Amino acid sequence: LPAKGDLHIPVFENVNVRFSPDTYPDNYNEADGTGVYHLVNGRIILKKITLPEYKRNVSVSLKVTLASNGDRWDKSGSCFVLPKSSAINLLTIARDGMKFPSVDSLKLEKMVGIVPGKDYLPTVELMRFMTPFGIGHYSNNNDSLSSKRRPVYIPKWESNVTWQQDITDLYPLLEGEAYVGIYIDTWTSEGYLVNADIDVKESRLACDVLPKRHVEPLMNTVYYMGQSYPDIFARRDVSTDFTVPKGAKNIRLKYIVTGHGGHSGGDEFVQKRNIISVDGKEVLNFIPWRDDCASFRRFNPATGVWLIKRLASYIGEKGYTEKEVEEPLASSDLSRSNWCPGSDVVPEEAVIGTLAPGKHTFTVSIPEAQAVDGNKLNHWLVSAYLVWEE
Amino acid sequence: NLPAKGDLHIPVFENVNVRFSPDTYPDNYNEADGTGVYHLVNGRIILKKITLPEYKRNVSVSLKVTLASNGDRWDKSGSCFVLPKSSAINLLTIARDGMKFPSVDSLKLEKMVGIVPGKDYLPTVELMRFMTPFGIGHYSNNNDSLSSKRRPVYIPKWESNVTWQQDITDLYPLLEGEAYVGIYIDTWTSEGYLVNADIDVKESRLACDVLPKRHVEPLMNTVYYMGQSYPDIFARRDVSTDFTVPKGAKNIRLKYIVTGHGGHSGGDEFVQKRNIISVDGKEVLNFIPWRDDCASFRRFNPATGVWLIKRLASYIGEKGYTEKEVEEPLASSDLSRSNWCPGSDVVPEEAVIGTLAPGKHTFTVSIPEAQAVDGNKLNHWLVSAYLVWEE
Ligand SMILES: [Cl-]
Ligand SMILES: [Cl-]
Ligand SMILES: [Cl-]
Ligand SMILES: [Cl-]
Ligand SMILES: [Cl-]
Ligand SMILES: [Cl-]
């Protein structure tokens, strides 16, 4: 098998992801001079990549560097790829007037685009991320503003955040021509600055043949374009049917979930079990949760802060002593439903192996999820797909 | 068509107590137990004989260490290591067979025995340098009413243990056939620590992916394992060693493992000191070993000391954005240090050398502003290095 060499793709360089109708007036706006499409008024950036026709096996990684350009919030992000066999996609919708297929309101309410339908497979996420609170733009380490915000145990603010993930399994969606993009739920004109690279390592072996891989998009509740907050789980489970062909080998489920609702007692800050199933049998069951958000403090200069009273032990003049202090607690410190401001989300994974050829059902259940209530925006960002060899 | 030897799981240490207990281990050498584990230096060093097959297919090798405190409250230095191949003198033969580190030219190495190669001796090679957190496990109980006095409002719970993992594929040559792998912790308590160590080997599933012939060249190790003193030598002179490179050596890479020490106010543990490392007089590495993120390890450090530091902090009060003088706790585990944090391992710095003329070459390590040992101010630098290459 012939080599086509490694490949470094700088998908995005210092691109401003933002909300600006004055700059990007429509949902579709022609690619700029750098080949970057700005959709949904700047909230989505998209780019056509071209990979060689690899005959050898490869590995693929995604690297994303991000900073705030003035936006002060920890907003949801998603680096994604538009699936192959789907005439309807984010681009064709915005550009060519395509629409997410109509849904049965009894089973999916008004939740368009979240599961497959006629001429539609859900967008597939290469990486889910959560921006920190104002990194870079508000990361001033000069004594002036720092002493007031920066805790004594944090020597300096980082100027940006970088995430890296192996996306080798999604290779079938990158092969040939593919549209890769980044969405950030930003509503400020300032927005964010992002870089994104896709690197491909080609095997140095003349015998290591590229396996025939497949990706099956099952679900994606991320509200990219004309979609609403996904609280449907507060009222019903969400299911989709899918087809497994003969010969499918080593089937694996990938499940990317984060919970949301930034108000007190909202699903962002409260434990809710996710039960995922195939053909009615549980294959994943867990509480999406992180107890380690303090570890991201340095990435979160613009976070809100409270004072919490605590009787704290300490070393004083006369030895081991005790005193009530008012200790700062950052919003960025709080435990959350599978993320911290400044983290990415590594997909949970279940090994299925083989399934009977034909139709199967995929179900996601978050039975105790809270509904949207006024300005309380509880919801669950869930995306999932199957990968397998043919 | 190269044969499949399979994946290998070697549980080197299970729940082994690294400790200082003359009562239990009265000598420097103590006969191995039924689990084949030798306890040396009165329990501060555990050693085990492992054997890797002579793999023909290419592989990847990983080391996983899990650790907890069994009572020791300190953030002590540790080193998981392998006794090099072509070296009659090693930690085991020194302790057991009454061998000794070769004598050294005092004008060049003072009393620093065992840190560079000598007659019948290559330095011990580190699979992983690590630094224990403050009392993890033994002091990690979370539903103790006297725990909220130690645990900050932003740390929901103490971790009960710490787990480090690293890819040690490049050290495969030191592991093939029979080898002694061990763990050293600078502990002076009977309680000590509890550790697990797993070495796992993943074999390629391709009949055509051949294992490359590889070599490890041990250059230095200043870690004070056995009858060795604190390495503050850098405060007075640079340390060099010569080494031989054979014809045909391809893709030479230097690995460099450094941590700075001296845990008093102003000591080399808490102060930035540039490291200049050279091959044949030319610099190949030059940087300040340093970590600014030690606060990120807070949840692993339940027995850390704590100070109150006054700070005018902004915050959301019961009437909007406000401002007030607080006494914010600062843990020792939060402080920036010379390439480590209590609870962290150290990933070796690497330098691509490429090729070197066959014959003698010189490796030199300089930390020019390192401070000397001064009474109970125990400044020193734990440095180890080795080259790797395919032949
Ligand atoms: Cl803002
Ligand atoms: Cl409805
Ligand atoms: Cl300043
Ligand atoms: Cl102790
Ligand atoms: Cl001397
Ligand atoms: Cl201390």
SS (H, E, C) A317-337: CCEEEEEEEEEEEEHHHCCEC
Among candidates B299, B306, B327 on the partner chain, residue whose Cβ is nearest the Cβ of A315: B306
Chain B hits for A156, Cβ within 8 Å: 292
Q: CB of B385 within 8 A of CB of B219?
A: yes
Residue A154 C-alpha from the chain's centroid: 27
CA distance B332 to B306: 6
B104 Cα to the center of ligand 5, angstroms: 10
Distance spanning both ends of chain B, measured CA to CA: 22
CA distance A305 to B289: 32
Method: X-ray
Q: Where are the beta strands (DSSP E) in B29-86?
A: 38-40, 45-52, 59-69, 77-82
B150:A313 CB<8 A: yes
Buried b / exposed e over B16-40, threshold 16 CB at 10 Å, is bbbbbbeeebeebbbeeeeeebbbb
Strand partners, A315: A320
Query: Is A290 an 8 Å CB contact of chain B?
Result: no
B318 — alpha (psi -120 to 50), left (phi > 0) or beta?
Answer: alpha
Identity of the amino acid at A35: G
Look up the CATH number of domain A212-390.
Answer: 2.60.120.230
Domain B1-212: give its CATH superfamily: Peptide-N-glycosidase F, N-terminal domain (2.60.120.1570)
CA distance A139 to A146: 8
Identity of the amino acid at A274: N
Which chain residues have CB less than 5 Å from ligand 1, an ion? A 72
Query: Is B318 an 8 Å CB contact of chain A?
Result: no
Query: Is B357 an 8 Å CB contact of chain A?
Result: no
Closest CA in chain A for residue B317: A306
Chain A hits for B295, Cβ within 8 Å: 151, 153-154, 294-295, 297-298
The alpha-carbon gap from B156 to the nearest alpha carbon of chain A, in Å, equals 6
Among candidates A206, A292, A329 on the partner chain, residue whose Cβ is nearest the Cβ of B153: A329
Identity of the amino acid at A387: V
Strand partners, B98: none
B137 Cα to the center of ligand 6, angstroms: 17
B156:A304 CB<8 A: no
Residue ranges per domain, chain B?
1-212, 213-391
CA distance A303 to B161: 30
Structure tokens at A317: 């003049």
Q: CB of A147 within 8 A of CB of A171?
A: no
Q: CB of B128 within 8 A of CB of B292?
A: no
The alpha-carbon gap from B195 to the nearest alpha carbon of chain A, in Å, equals 23
Structure tokens at B26: 């009265």
Among candidates B149, B298, B315 on the partner chain, residue whose Cβ is nearest the Cβ of A307: B315
The alpha-carbon gap from A137 to the nearest alpha carbon of chain B, in Å, equals 18
Interface test with B, best of A140, A314, A318 (most B CBs within 10 A): A314
B298:A294 CB<8 A: yes
Asked if domains A1-211 and A212-390 share a fold, the reply is yes
- Judged on CB neighbours under 10 Å (0-12, 13-18, 19+), A200 is buried
Three-state DSSP at B206 gives: coil
Chain A hits for B334, Cβ within 8 Å: 152-153
The CATH number of domain A1-211, selected from 2.60.120.1570, 3.10.520.10, 3.40.50.720, 1.20.1260.10: 2.60.120.1570
Q: Where are the beta strands (DSSP E) in chain A?
A: 7-17, 36-39, 44-50, 58-68, 76-81, 124-130, 161-166, 177-184, 192-202, 213-220, 238-244, 249-260, 274-278, 281-286, 305-316, 319-330, 344-345, 348-353, 358-365, 379-389
Resolution of this PDB entry, in A?
2.3
CA distance B115 to B93: 16
Query: Is A298 an 8 Å CB contact of chain B?
Result: yes
Give me the CATH topology for the region B213-391.
Answer: Jelly Rolls (2.60.120)
Describe chain A by its helix, strand, coil percentages, rounded to 5: 10, 45, 45
B276 Cα to the center of ligand 1, angstroms: 45
Least Cα distance to A252 among A355, A171, A173 occurs for: A355
| B136 DSSP 8-state letter | T
Cβ-based neighbour number of residue B146 at 10 Å: 9
CA distance A338 to A346: 10
A313:B152 CB<8 A: no
Among all bound ligands, the one having the nearest atom to the CA of A111 is 2
Among candidates A205, A298, A326 on the partner chain, residue whose Cβ is nearest the Cβ of B293: A298
Among all bound ligands, the one having the nearest atom to the CA of B75 is 6
Structure tokens at A247: 């010969």
Query: Is A304 an 8 Å CB contact of chain B?
Result: yes
A316:B308 CB<8 A: yes
Chain B hits for A292, Cβ within 8 Å: 299
| B176 DSSP 8-state letter | B
Identity of the amino acid at A326: E
Among candidates A147, A312, A315 on the partner chain, residue whose Cβ is nearest the Cβ of B311: A147
CA distance B132 to B136: 8
Which chain residues have CB less than 5 Å from ligand 4, an ion? B 73
